[PDB]
Design a binder for this molecule. Structure first.
Ligand SMILES: Nc1ncnc2c1ncn2[C@@H]1O[C@H](COP(=O)(O)OP(=O)(O)NP(=O)(O)O)[C@@H](O)[C@H]1O
Ligand SMILES: Nc1ncnc2c1ncn2[C@@H]1O[C@H](COP(=O)(O)OP(=O)(O)NP(=O)(O)O)[C@@H](O)[C@H]1O
Ligand SMILES: Nc1ncnc2c1ncn2[C@@H]1O[C@H](COP(=O)(O)OP(=O)(O)NP(=O)(O)O)[C@@H](O)[C@H]1O
Ligand SMILES: Nc1ncnc2c1ncn2[C@@H]1O[C@H](COP(=O)(O)OP(=O)(O)NP(=O)(O)O)[C@@H](O)[C@H]1O
Ligand SMILES: Nc1ncnc2c1ncn2[C@@H]1O[C@H](COP(=O)(O)OP(=O)(O)NP(=O)(O)O)[C@@H](O)[C@H]1O
Ligand SMILES: Nc1ncnc2c1ncn2[C@@H]1O[C@H](COP(=O)(O)OP(=O)(O)NP(=O)(O)O)[C@@H](O)[C@H]1O
Ligand SMILES: Nc1ncnc2c1ncn2[C@@H]1O[C@H](COP(=O)(O)OP(=O)(O)NP(=O)(O)O)[C@@H](O)[C@H]1O
Ligand SMILES: [Mg+2]
Ligand SMILES: [Mg+2]
Ligand SMILES: [Mg+2]
Ligand SMILES: [Mg+2]
Ligand SMILES: [Mg+2]
Ligand SMILES: [Mg+2]
Ligand SMILES: [Mg+2]
Lengths: 244, 244, 242, 245, 246, 244, 244
C-alpha cells in the first residue's frame, strides 16, 4: 500500500485509507525518463556514506514541470509505491503554515517518505520566501529527506528556489511522443498486433498538434475493450471549440 | 424513492431539510440525444470499477454542464441524481470556513452513491486556493468512487487546468431551445394533442425569437394552463420586450 | 392581522406586534395591474398538482420595480393581508448572512408567507452564486413565494431575474389619470366624479411626473377639504430646494 | 414645570442621557416669519389625527427635514419644539460601529412614546448600516406607527431623493441666514422694553454691513453687549466680515 | 496656595493625571498687548452670568480657539488661565482608539465642574469619532451646561467653518510671533531691575536681526544668558536664522 | 554602573544587567562639542530655581543628528554615565504605545534619567503626531525631565517637533575632523609620538572625502597593538564598491 | 556536534537533534577567504580585554553576500563547528517578533553561539527598521555577541544596517574561480593526479561563464567514484534552457 500524510499543526497524520499502489508501468513518460529518475533516486537512497564522508547534506530534491495532464502527480504516486515510500502532502498556501511550522514539519517527516510540494509557483504566522529557501536548504535542514516539487509554470519560479541543493533534478513532463502513444495503446489493449498501436500513433500525431496522456486515457475510456473502435474514431481527437 | 441533499458543516456532510421528491428525467428536455449520452457515460463509469483498478486508473469521474441561464443544468443534475438513486452533496467553493484541508476531507467522506455538485465554479476564481481545488479534484490524495458535477454560465472564464481530462471527463453545452426541444416540451405540458400542434408551436416560436430558454417556454405555458390553443395563438408575446 | 418575521441567525422570529392589514383598495396601482398580480398568485397557490404532474418546482417569484413612492412596499403589505400571508423580511446586505444561512432561512420560512427581498440591486458573507442557487437550485424548497423590489431594474444581472427565479416582473410607475381620480375618490369619498376629474386634469397639466406618495402628501395638507385640494394644485408644480 | 428627557441608544434599547433638561421656550428660537407656526401646526395636526390615517390605511408616521447653513436654528428649534409638545428626544447616530440594519429597525420600533427621533447630519451616513436598511426602517413593510422622525443637514444636495421622498420626509424646511424680521425679533428678545424703532435701526444697519449673518452670530454679538442695547446699535461695523490672522 | 489638577479620559470617565501641578502665573505668559486681558474679561463675564443665559433660554456653554505658529503661548496661556480661574483641565484627545461619538458625549457631560476641556491640535482629528459626532457633542440637543472648551491649532485654515461657528467657538484669538512690546516685556521678566532703555535696545536689535521670532526662541536665548542681561543684549546676531548642517 | 529601563505597558522596568559606564573620553566628538553639551545639561540640572522663579517648565530636550556611526548613541551612553543618570529606552514605533501610554511613561520616568527617543524621524491604540508634541511640551508635561532625540535625517522632522521648549539644543554629529583622527589614534595607541597621530590624520584625509569614527574604530580593530600597521595600510580606507 | 536553537516567544529552544559538524575543509571558498574570517573571529573571541580597556562594545557582526549556491549557509555551519559554537536561527520576517522580543532574544542568546540572520534584505507587535538597528548597535545591545547576516542582494541593504559596529566584516561569496574548481575536484576524487583537477578546471571555465560550487557538487554527484567520467562529460555543464 501507499500511506498519505497531511499536516495537522506541527505534525503529520494519516489521510484516509492506505491506497493501492499505482504500478510504475501504468504511467507512460517519454522514453527513458522514468528509468533516469528511478536510477537517480535509488542512487541517493543507496549512498548515505558517500554524502557523510564528503560532508554534504544528505537530502535530494526533484522538480517535475509541464502542462496539465501529462503524468506529474501520477508518476510521483507510482514512484512512491515502487520505492515503498509514503507521501507527505505539504500545502504551502495555508492559513496555519508559518516559517516555524514548515521547519518543524520538514524535520519530523515520516522516514521512507516523499515530501510533495504541488504547484510551488502558486506560493509566490504566514510563510515567507526566505523561510521556504532556508527550510529546504539551510543551517537547520534535516537529512534523509526527499522533496518533490511540481509546476505548470517553471518560468515563474525564482532561480534560488530550484538551484542545485534545493532541486537536484529538473524534468520536463510533456505532451505525447510517438513512443508514448504506442506504449499507452499496448497497456490499454494488451495482446493486439504492434502494427495496430503504430496505426493509432501515426493517425493521432496527424490529427493533433499536442495531445496529453490524460486526453489519450479519456479517449480509451470511450472504447473500453474496443481497440478497433479506438483506431477508427481518431478524427474525434482533432481539437473542437467550446460552444460560445 | 426520494433525493437526499447534503451540505458541509465543518469537515462533515449533514442532510439539508427533507428528502426531496425525485424530478423525473423525462420532465427535463435537453437537446436531442444529450441526456441519453450523459446517462450512458455515468452508468458505464458506475458499472466498471474493475476496468479502472486493473489499469491502475483513479476510479473518479467529473462532468461539466455549461451554458446560458434557464436551459436545464441544475434541473438535469437533480433528475439524473433521482434516476441513479444518488444523493447530492452541495459544495460551495466561496465560503468562509472552507480551507484546502477541509475541501480534501469533505471530498474524502462524501456519502456513497452521491454526486458532488460545484455550481458556478467560474465564481471561485483558512480559505480555498486554486491549487488546493485542482489537487483535491485530481491529485495524490484524491479518493475513489467519486463523481463531481460542475456548472458555469461562462466556460471561457475557466482555467484549462481545472477542467482537463481526469478532473472533467465530459463537458456538455446546455443551450437555448432547438426545434426538437420545443415540440418535446409542448407534448409534455399538453399531453394528448396532435403532434402537428406541437410542430405549429415550434415553427412559430423559432420565427418570433432568435433565442428562447426552456425556462421562458415553461413560464409561457404557465400562462396557458390546460389551454394548448392559447399557447399556439399568443406566441407573438415571446418576441423580446424591454423592461419599463 | 399581518405577522412580520425577521432573521435571527438561521431562524425566523416575529418582529413587534401583529400589524393591522392594509386594505388592497387603499393601494392604487395602474388600471388592471393589482388584479393581474392577485390572479397570478392565487392561480399559483391553487395549482400545486399542475406543477407536480409536470415535475416543475412548486415556487414562484415576483419583481416589482420603479421609482420611489409608487406602491411597491405598500402593495406587498396589502397583498399579504388579502392572501392571509405573513411576511419574512430577508436583508441580503447583512454581516451574519452567508450562502449557508440564506439556504436554511429560505428552507424554514413560515408557511403561508411572502419572502420579501427589498432593493435586491443593492446586494451586488453572501455571494451572487449563493443567492441564485438559493432562489432556483438543486436544494431550493417548494410552496415558496418570493417578492423582490428595486428602483433600478437595469442594475440587476439577467440570471438573478430569469424565469424560475422571477416569474412575473411588473413596473410600478408615476400616476396615470386613472390613479389620480381613484386616489381623490378614496381620500374624499362622496364627492362628484366630476371633481376627481377636475383634480386629475389639472395635476397632469401642472406636473410631468407625480408619485402616489406625493399625491398622498398633498391630500394630507387638505384633510376633509376637497375644494382646498382642487384649488391649490399649482403648489405641485416642481420647486427647487433652497 | 415640565422638562425634556434625552435618550441615546445602548445596543438595541434607549436609555436616559444625563439630567432632564430645562425646556427651551419656542419663542427663544426666532425662525423666518411664519416658519415655526407652519411646523407646529403640521405636527399637532399629525398628533391629533390618528383616525384619519387608520381610516385611509396610511402608515401613521411623519418625517421632517430641517436643512441649511450652520448656526441658523435647526438643533435649537427641534429642542424647543420637543419642549412645546412635551415630547422627549431620541438621539440616533447613523455613523456608529454597533449600529446594524437589524438594530436600527429594533431601535425605531421601541422608541419611547411621545418622542422625536432625531437624525442629525443625515448626509454624513452616506455589522454596519446600509442605505437600503435606513430606507426600509424609515418607510418599509416592518416600520412602526405613532413615530415622528426629524432629520437635519447642512447639505440637502448630498441626500439621495429616495431618502427624503414623501412617506420618509413629509415636510422639508430651509432654515437660513437672518431676514430683516429675524433681526428685529432677536433684538426685542435680547433687549426687552426698548422702542421697536431701535430694533429697526439695528436690523437696517446689520443688513448694510453684512451679505449673510446667522442667528448664532447675532446671539454672539448680543453676548458682547449684555444689558447694553445702545452698545449693540453703535458697534454694528464690527459685524462686517474679518479674515482669520 | 492653589494647584492645577489635570484629568485624562479612562473609558467614559475622567481620572486625575499625576500630581496637582504648580500654577503658572498669568504674568509669566506674555501675549500681544491687551490679548490676555480681553480673554480673561470674556471668560469671567461668562462664569459670572448664568442667569443672563437661562433667562434668554441660551445654552450656558462657551468655546475658545487659540490659533497660530508653534511656540507662541497657546498651551502655556491656557495652563496659566486655568490657574488664575482656579479651574482644573480635562485633556481630551480626539485622535484615540477607544473614543467613539457615544464616549465623547458622555465625557463632555461628566467633566469635573470648574474645568476647561482642552482639545489641542483639533485640525488633526479630520468604534471611532465622526465629524458630526464632534459637532453635536460641542453644540447639539444633548450638550450639557456650565461647560468651557478650549481648542488650539497651528492651522486654522484646515478647520471646517461648522466646527468653529459661534455657539461651538465664541472667541477665536491669533497667538503670533513677538511684537516690540512682547520683546521688552519678556526682557523685563527674565532680567528684573534693568533700565527700560536696555529692554528697548534688546527689542529694536532683535526686530532688525529677525523677520519672525517666537516667544519660545526668546525664552531659549535668555536660557543661554541666565543672570547676564548684557550678554543677552550683546549676542543678538546669534538669533539671525542659521541652517541645520545638511 | 548605568541602568537601562524599557517600557512594559505604562511602567518602566530594568533591562538586563547594570552596564559598565563608557568613559566620556572614549567618545571623540568634534572639538568642544562634548564640553558644550555637558556644560548645558549641568547648567539645567543645577538651576531649577531660575526656572521656577520665571514660571518656565523645568524640562530640557536635546537632538543629536547626523550620519550613521559618528557617536550619537555612544555619546548619550557615556553622558548618562558621567552624570550618574540611568537611560529610559522609549521606542515610538511600537504596537502597544498610545498617546495615553506615552503621557504616563514620560510622567513616571525614574528620576536622574535621560529619556532616549532614537530615530525620531521614523515615527512619522497608536501614537499620533499631536500626542507626541503634547507629551513633550503641553499642559500635562512633567518637570525635572530630560529627553534626548536622535536622527540620521533632520530634514524629515517637522519644525513643531523640535522647536525650543521641545528641543532646546540641536547638535550635528559628523564625519571625522583632523582633530578627531589624531585624538582617536592617541586613544587606540597610547604612548606613541603625537607626530605619528599627525601622519595618520593627514594621510586618512587625503585617501577619503568622508570617514566616520565607526570606520576609524573598525580599521584600528585590524591593527590591535600595531600602530605602524595602522599608519602603513591607510590606502585600504579609500572607498571600494561591493562586488554588487 | 553543532546545536541549532530557534526562538519560541522571548526564549531560545533546541531545534531537533545535535547535528554532525560539517568539516571547514568540505566548504571551498575563494583562496584565503575562509582563513581571513576564521582569523578575524578568533581574534575577536580572544581579545575582550582590548575592547573593555578602550570602552568599545564587545560585539562583532559579519555579512556574507552573493549569488545562490556559493557557500554562505554551508560556511557558517562549518565555522560554528570549527569554533565549537551553536547557532541561533533568528527569523526577522515573523508575526510574533516585535522590537521588544528581538532585544530580549539577542540579550539571552546561548553563550558560544552565532546569531544567524539569513536573507536580511527580505525584512525591509511587529519589527521596525529602527528596532533592528538599535538591537544590533544601540544603548541596550549586549556584549560577547556574534551576528552573521547573509543576502543575495547587498544593493538592497540600507547602509545604516551594515555600517561598522553593526557589520564589521563584509565578504563576497561568488561563482567558482579556477582554484575552487581544482580544490573541489581533489576533495570529491582524492588521490588523483593534480594534472586531472587542472584538466577539469580549464575545461569547465571554457564551457561556462559562471558556475556555482552547488552546480559542481551536483555534477560530481552524477560521477560518484568516476573522476574520468567527471572530466569527459564537462560539455553537459554548458547552460541549457528549461523546456518552454
Ligand atoms: N504519463 C501518463 N501516463 C499514464 N496516464 C497518465 C499520464 N499522465 C496523465 N495520465 C492520466 O491522466 C490523469 C492525470 O494524470 P496526472 O499525473 O494527475 O497529471 P498532472 O501532470 O499531475 N496534471 P496537473 O496537476 O494538472 O499539472 C490521471 O488519471 C492519469 O492516469
Ligand atoms: N431543459 C429543460 N427542460 C425542462 N425544464 C427546463 C429546462 N431548462 C430549464 N427548465 C426549467 O426552467 C427552470 C430553471 O431550470 P434550471 O435547470 O434550474 O436552469 P439552469 O440551467 O441551472 N439555470 P442557471 O442556474 O440560471 O444557469 C426550472 O423551473 C426548470 O424546470
Ligand atoms: N400606489 C399607491 N397607492 C396609495 N398610496 C401609495 C401608493 N404608492 C405609495 N403610496 C403611499 O406613499 C407611501 C410610500 O408607499 P410605498 O409603497 O412604501 O412606496 P415604494 O414604491 O415602496 N417606495 P420606495 O421604497 O422608495 O421604492 C406610503 O405612505 C403609501 O401610503
Ligand atoms: N434661529 C435662531 N434663534 C435663536 N438662536 C439661534 C438661532 N439659530 C441659532 N441660534 C443660536 O446659535 C446656536 C446654534 O443654534 P443651533 O440651532 O444649534 O444651530 P444649527 O442650525 O443646528 N447649527 P448646525 O448644527 O451647525 O447646523 C445656539 O446657541 C442658538 O441659541
Ligand atoms: N507668549 C509666551 N510667553 C512666555 N513664554 C512663552 C510664550 N509662548 C511660548 N513660551 C514658552 O515657550 C514654550 C512653549 O510655550 P507653549 O505655550 O507650549 O507654545 P504653543 O504655542 O502651545 N506651541 P505649539 O503647541 O507647538 O503650537 C514654553 O516653555 C513657554 O514657557
Ligand atoms: N565619535 C566616536 N568616537 C568613538 N567611537 C565612536 C564614535 N562614533 C562611533 N563610534 C564607535 O562606532 C560604533 C557606533 O557608534 P554609535 O554612537 O552607536 O553611532 P551612531 O551615531 O549612534 N550611529 P547610527 O545609530 O547608525 O546613527 C561603536 O562601536 C562606537 O564605539
Ligand atoms: N563553496 C562551497 N563549497 C562546497 N560546497 C558548496 C559550496 N557552496 C555551496 N556548496 C554546496 O551546495 C549546496 C548549497 O550551499 P549553501 O552554502 O547552502 O549555499 P548558499 O550560498 O547559502 N545559497 P543560498 O541560500 O541559495 O543563497 C550545499 O549542498 C553545499 O554543500
Ligand atoms: Mg497534478
Ligand atoms: Mg442553475
Ligand atoms: Mg419601498
Ligand atoms: Mg445643529
Ligand atoms: Mg502647544
Ligand atoms: Mg545610533
Ligand atoms: Mg543559504
Amino acid at each position: 500500500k501507499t500511506v498519505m500524510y497531511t499536516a495537522v499543526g506541527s505534525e503529520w497524520r494519516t489521510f484516509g485509507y492506505p491506497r493501492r499502489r499505482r504500478p510504475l508501468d501504468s504511467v507512460v513518460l517519454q522514453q527513458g525518463l522514468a528509468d533516469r529518475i528511478v536510477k537517480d533516486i535509488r542512487e541517493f537512497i543507496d549512498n548515505p556514506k558517500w554524502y557523510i564522508d564528503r560532508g554534504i547534506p544528505y537530502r535530494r530534491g526533484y522538480l517535475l514541470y509541464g502542462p496539465p495532464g501529462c503524468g506529474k502527480s501520477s508518476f510521483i504516486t507510482a514512484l512512491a509505491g515502487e520505492l515503498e515510500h509514503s507521501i507527505c502532502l505539504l500545502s504551502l498556501t495555508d492559513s496555519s503554515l508559518s516559517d516555524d511550522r514548515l521547519n518543524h514539519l520538514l524535520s519530523v517527516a515520516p522516514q521512507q517518505s516523499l515530501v510533495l510540494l504541488e504547484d510551488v509557483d502558486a506560493a509566490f504566522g504566514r510563510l515567507t520566501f526566505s523561510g521556504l529557501l532556508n527550510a529546504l536548504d539551510g543551517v537547520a535542514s534535516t537529512e534523509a529527506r526527499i522533496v518533490f516539487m511540481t509546476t505548470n509554470y517553471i518560468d515563474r519560479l525564482d532561480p534560488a528556489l530550484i538551484r542545485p541543493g534545493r532541486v537536484d533534478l529538473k524534468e520536463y513532463v510533456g505532451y505525447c511522443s510517438h513512443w508514448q502513444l504506442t506504449q499507452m495503446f499496448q497497456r490499454f489493449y494488451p495482446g493486439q498486433a504492434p502494427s495496430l498501436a503504430e496505426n493509432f500513433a501515426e493517425h493521432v500525431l496527424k490529427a493533433t498538434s499536442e495531445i496529453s496522456p490524460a486526453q489519450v486515457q479519456g479517449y480509451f475510456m470511450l472504447y473500453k475493450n474496443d481497440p478497433m473502435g479506438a483506431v477508427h474514431n481518431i478524427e474525434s481527437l482533432r481539437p473542437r471549440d467550446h460552444h460560445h
